Symmetry: C3
Subunit: 596 residues, 3 copies
């Protein structure tokens, strides 16, 4: 009996019944212990003696054996024990080798990481993906990963190692073709990686989530080509209540927190500091296989960010046989700033960027039905390169309502670069334009409409303080066609501006252009006593449907007209009043109106 | 000794002290095992031998025995083990039998569902409620359920069985008169049910929540009368970060994701696909016993939905002795579309519906202080039956600010049906009206004001592109009284519209109606050289307080007035200028204004 | 052998191998039991015999021994078992004694509270902090607490004891200088305390969170000086999805739910009932040591509240050597009401308060770049003391867009109290002003601008129903300077108001003041037949740049001007038309405009 009890089957001979309940199962101790499983149950030598983890022990084969075994019983949760650091020091074998994989995840096998998982110096200057849910080196030939959850209070530490070559890839968790998989509570830290977590593969997958995770210092070298902390490449998936922080200079130029690349995906309630970019919201044609060629129902909400480049980047593109489309997007409730930096020292600061494709093409995009509402954006006064929207590629629609934008430009695109075709750009009057950059705008147009064309668009400019340094509130170069559009500049804070709206090709004269803006106009009257006409000296008002006075009348003996219409020769005309006769000459501030 | 050790009391004779710590308790192994409990501890035959679960084993009595026992010790958490499917194959007995109950929940007894719970074919064509927290067949005589949490990565599978009769009810979890109860992480799938989860009973309960659950394919037949996935019938309760999906045709006509039926309830951060409706926000008088007759502090925020009918339905109603009231509601940050379907093939598409009671009555409602803000709504161009709001019952107030609505109608109610009494409907100018349905609106009014009366309301219409197909921007039939209201149509994109605002009963003449809209007006002048009057040929402008030109003047020799007032006979009059004399005749586009 | 097996080392001699897997570790039963730990492992007498908890057992030393031991092994999670109430009945010793501490938390040692922790009557009329993460009585000399998480379905019950003296402090969890610490799922109840949870210390700490907790009845006496349920005093931290309830009268006068006192902090998705205040958003100079002197990236979103005082209070202040600054704040998506109460029976009702410092100073604040958007606020009609914003201290900027405010005042400050200096106050026209207080406003100004000065501000007043009881829509006393500002009153619902905008110092005449509002004006014409001038009888319009008719013309034989300008003597003048000659005299409602 002593032999049996001291043997590995001993617990299988000690009887147990829950709480001495006579109605409970008559079990053995081993049965109850078998209800849970930990890395300790596989972390042993060939004789079955436990091995202590440590920097000189490679725990990989043992964790893999645990996963393989639990998988074979239909699943369960393997605990990675608290109070220990478990080092990984070799590559996995088989289907994950094509992904530089360390551990292969399996369906229905959850990992409760309570301790620490650390990469050993074997991985220095090498590629790696720590956990991989693909089962084949070719993702198109891979099976699915289902019902795999990684959670706990533990840590994945990437060892601080730099990339060896820019062409290498590194990742924390690649769920693969992933259905009902998640990471919750985990801290990913101290690395130079491409991604921390990737969900899905080219639209294959569903219901994958990253929640309450921390991502700290995951870019550290000039070799790192690019970094996006979470890449969401399956629909009905997203990122919620996470924390993302970088301290490296390199991160300010290369790092983004999230990629939302399939329909019905979201990024909410998260805090970002030290990154270049917040989130891309994109449909890549090359990623359209599993869920279609449309990214729709895309949500970026209630995030807090300090970034150095752009908050949300919108795009779509094409391959030889597939066209990507982006539509039905909402960006709301976010509070975002460009961190302290010199002008032009990081990628151009923006709340929204309409980004050209990876080859720089600006004529492949199909982006529409986007609502940007209830956000606040701030950039310090010295940051010349800061805009509410950098509109750098073709845009089929974007709507701004009730935001507060406090930066250098509202709408911007650089002259002599791309010439976007713009449709359905709507900037509602409820967007509040801050004053941080007042007096910084010499030579600059607040809305700098450097486009090929603008149609079906609305720009309602409302200032909230004076900035007499700017060249204009809104400027259209002669190369920009403008039609079926409404462009207004409210008069408040504009009395002393030389230029308010500027149409360098006289585009405001278009049949279906609806415009109003302030201007200074010189008038002269006829001599007649009584009701008497006043006429503008200049003849550039053939497009004006009505105008009205924004100036007081300092005179007693006469008054100019309150309101004006035009004449065929381009003069304004109105009827004033001469109490006493005489030719009058006045300079008046008018609101010029066309069809409004 | 061998006898004792091999007996069910054996573990109670093997000593243990935590980590050989001399300061720790000297325990027995059974004491430590007794800290946890699983279904295995009760899933046994009358001799105490464990029984394997499977499709031919009814696990119900064993799970019930586990719950009953743990309850008797003041509570705890019972694990339903991973790697097994536990089938239920009979009805429960006692107080839950009146609810077609399977398992009776008890207070302080949590269920950690890691494996799968599946209904056996016993339940085919039958009613059932899988988990029931009532302790009496009459809910009014039931005790409370407190501190009961169901959570884990597991699954409740309803076996795919159709309803046997439309009058049957099916549910997953009915917490009952439930205080501090929740479901977290669970997947409910593969059924034809009435509800997945119900919280509370007629206002009795508090602090009940559904979080991070999935609801997949829970309607599958034409027999199913109605489906709402979660019914929230207790205050201080709600649904967060859930996923709801249906694939059946029937679901598009009958299924809603959530009912919010008591005060201080919420629905946030969730994704819905394949349903008829998003959420009802309702006070039923028949449900007012536990928490009063007011549903207030109701929140529907930051959800993503593809539906076929209406997103949010508002209502309240009465019984013989109780009147229900709905107020203090916020609907914000949601992105919603009507999915691809033929016009009129599902219930009328809407973002907000003001829904008549279950008997069709439209004169029992008391709905006010609702804020709908920062949402986006889209319906494909062919969907005639799509509206920002279908206003089908009496409304005491609803406020729309800063939404983007891209569908056929803005405000709609069908003529020849109900005649709501409308008060305090506010449609702010910051609502952006999309252009998807441009050119589809022959014979249709964008705001079709088919009401008995409208008072204290604001409609500020702002187009963002042309749609010359529509009959009018806004139309009031002669049967609709209109008073103490502001109705404006911005001129942008309206120059070529025959009708902008239409008042078929000349209601715009009311003493406290404030209106402005564009119109085309024919004028003739007197012969006089110099300042000269122009008068309208028609006499239907007795209500106009001022008008101004929206047209250019192609003439050199004269100009019509910039601005006009009226005369007692209903003509417009203004003072223009004849450089040379002559009777003039012009047709001008004017902004007509009344009291604005 | 029997001796060994019955001894505390017995489990260390019974062999086990997971699921009889020949590839698994050959362990002993004690090894597997050692993977978990509970209070039972330390809750024993000096001979190692287990002690049952209860109201006459002080569990403190045992829980402390458990924490101290697990800490020494590098951490883990200690379960506090379900089905038992564990009483605490003495103070801790050492570093926590200076904090009236009971239990000392240690790094990496989590507490899974499943049962109940209750304070014994030892603590009646005494100070206490139940769990303390400081390790020194002087916080400036304390070490850090890291990686400490408290979670579960359990309860902390404060025994209902009143404070003994107002100067005492009581707390539930003081994490201290806390990095990666959290409380999740716990119910804190039945107390008279200062705080339930405090995060951080004077800016030291990071990544601390309170999620899914309940706070119920934590103020019960007149002795309690002040209460804030969660104080967030470290950056990158916040409160999400919590429930806060009070029933005591005292709570309505003293209690706030949250303090956000460091940068990158948030309060979201929570429900509050019975409190005085929602949240303070503040930078105290005295708290600036660990994270700097700026509170920025502050977020209060998507909360539901019934309160009696103010929802969000903004402030910053100074010490002898440090100045605090508050900027980059967003308050969005909240639905808030003042609960039923008599006027003036609790602190002044407000959605936003700009609060003077703790000494009452209103000239130390530096608050700017605040966005308040998409919120709804309601106060019952009798509550005179209710305002969208009580602006009681110096303000450098606050922006309101797309809110719905239904209360007595929009902007308020009490006359004869503080005289704030106001800059960059922006009230967009998209704010909807409710009608609950219509007819209650005798003697009152809707926007009561009781300030020293206002600059760079925008107030666009838009009514949505009539209230002829109010004295004015907006009033500036003569003591308030006004410059570089835009003040407009839309005409809708204003026709019968005697006063719309009132400038008691004629401030609207300022060179850079842009204003428009309705007024009634008496005019007389000259006798001349034909085009004929009309002039105002009064001479107080020297500041008017244009005016236009808001009245119809009941006359046939003449018409007054549609539009007017002014003259040097302060008369309005315009050109009307006398079909037949005669001196005319009319009273007209005009929109008066200055520079707009
Ligand atoms: C499936 C569902 O919940 N449908 C919703 C309707 O519920 C009733 O619920 C329907 C609601 O009335 C409407 C609200 O819109 C209408 O909109 C609300 C209706 O929406 C359906 O989605 C609900 O009434 O009214 C609005 C206000 O006037 C108006 O604006 C709008 O335009 C209208 O359309 O929304 C849904 O459609 C609701 N439907 C569902 C499926 O939730 O109809 C239900 C049909 O299933 C259900 O009635 C049945 O069940 C009750 C309850 O069953 C008894 O009690 C329980 C406790 C025991 O366990 C059972 O064994 C049984 O004894 C039966 O009495 C009734 O005869 C059945 O037809 C809804 O009942 C409520 O169910 C909840 C959840 O279980 C209970 O907590 C609550 O006590 C029940 N309320 C009442 C009054 O009985 C019923 O409200
Ligand atoms: C109960 C509470 O937190 N009240 C809030 C006030 O806190 C002080 O906190 C109050 C805040 O000052 C005000 C802010 O609004 C006012 O608004 C802020 C005040 O709001 C109360 O709600 C807080 O100061 O100032 C604004 C800015 O100028 C202005 O806009 C506004 O109009 C003003 O009204 O908000 C609340 O009212 C705060 N009150 C509460 C209860 O949080 O007052 C507190 C009273 O309890 C408290 O002071 C006491 O406690 C400190 C701390 O105790 C020592 O240190 C700790 C670490 C040890 O454990 C203890 O044993 C003890 O040695 C005592 O020094 C002091 O003498 C007591 O009166 C607040 O102190 C801060 O407590 C937090 C949380 O524990 C600490 O992390 C922090 O270090 C403390 N800060 C300071 C400067 O001591 C105090 O700020
Ligand atoms: Na590869
Ligand atoms: Na890139
Ligand atoms: Na990137
Ligand atoms: Na029943
Ligand atoms: Na129904
Ligand atoms: Na329904
Ligand atoms: Na102290
Ligand atoms: Na205080
Ligand atoms: Na307080």
């Amino acid at each position: 009996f002593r032999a049996i009890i001291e043997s590995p089957e001993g617990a299988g001979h000690v009887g147990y019944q829950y709480r001495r309940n006579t109605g409970s199962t008559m079990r053995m101790v081993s049965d109850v212990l078998d209800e849970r499983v930990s890395l300790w149950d596989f972390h042993c030598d060939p004789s079955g003696n436990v091995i202590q983890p440590g920097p000189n022990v490679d725990s990989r084969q043992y964790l893999q054996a645990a996963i393989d075994y639990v998988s074979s019983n239909g699943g369960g949760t393997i605990t990675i024990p608290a109070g220990y650091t478990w080092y990984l020091g070799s590559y996995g074998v088989g289907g994950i080798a094509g992904h530089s994989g360390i551990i292969q995840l399996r369906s229905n096998v959850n990992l409760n990481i309570e301790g620490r998982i650390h990469l050993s110096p074997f991985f220095d200057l090498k590629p790696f993906q720590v956990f991989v849910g693909f089962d084949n080196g070719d993702p198109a030939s891979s099976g699915n990963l289902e019902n795999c959850h990684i959670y706990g209070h533990g840590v994945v530490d990437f060892g601080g190692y730099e990339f060896g070559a820019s062409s290498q890839l590194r990742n924390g968790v690649a769920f693969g073709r992933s259905y009902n998989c998640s990471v919750t509570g985990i801290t990913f830290q101290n690395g130079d990686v491409t991604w921390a977590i990737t969900l899905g593969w080219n639209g294959y997958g569903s219901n994958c989530y990253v929640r309450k995770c921390r991502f700290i210092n995951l870019v550290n070298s000039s070799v790192n080509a690019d970094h996006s902390t979470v890449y969401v490449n399956c629909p009905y998936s997203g990122v919620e209540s996470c924390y993302f922080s970088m301290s490296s200079s390199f991160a300010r130029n290369i790092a983004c927190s999230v990629q939302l690349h399939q329909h019905d995906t979201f990024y909410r309630g998260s805090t970002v500091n030290g990154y270049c970019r917040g989130a891309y919201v994109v449909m890549h044609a090359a990623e359209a296989a599993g869920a279609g060629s449309y990214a729709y129902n895309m949500q970026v909400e209630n995030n807090i960010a300090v970034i150095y480049g752009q908050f949300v980047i919108l795009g779509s593109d094409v391959t030889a046989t597939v066209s990507g489309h982006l539509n039905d997007v909402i960006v709301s409730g976010n509070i975002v700033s460009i961190g302290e930096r010199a002008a032009f020292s990081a990628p151009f600061g923006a709340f929204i960027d309409i980004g050209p494709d990876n080859s720089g093409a600006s004529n492949v995009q199909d982006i529409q039905r986007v609502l940007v509402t209830g956000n606040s954006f701030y950039a310090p006064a010295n940051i010349t390169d800061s805009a509410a929207i950098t509109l750098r590629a073709n845009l089929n629609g974007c709507t701004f309502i009730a935001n507060n934008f406090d930066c250098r430009y509202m709408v911007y695109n650089a002259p002599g670069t791309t010439s976007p075709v713009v449709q359905n750009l709507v900037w509602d009057k409820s967007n509040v334009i801050g004053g941080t950059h007042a007096n910084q705008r010499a030579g600059q147009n607040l809305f700098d409409m450097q486009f090929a064309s603008v149609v079906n668009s609305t720009i309602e400019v409302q200032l909230s303080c004076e900035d007499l340094s700017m060249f204009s509130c809104i400027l259209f170069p002669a190369s920009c066609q403008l039609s079926y559009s409404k462009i207004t500049v409210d008069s408040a804070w504009t009395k002393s501006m030389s230029n308010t709206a500027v149409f360098e090709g006289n585009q405001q004269a278009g049949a279906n252009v609806y415009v109003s803006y302030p201007a200074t106009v010189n008038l002269t009257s006829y001599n007649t006593q009584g009701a008497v006409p006043f006429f503008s000296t200049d003849t550039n008002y053939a497009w004006v449907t009505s105008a009205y006075s924004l100036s007081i009348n300092e005179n007693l003996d006469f008054s100019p007209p309150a309101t004006y219409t035009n004449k065929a020769n381009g003069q304004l005309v109105g009827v004033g009043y001469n109490e006493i006769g005489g030719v009058r000459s006045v300079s008046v501030r008018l609101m010029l109106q066309r069809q409004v």
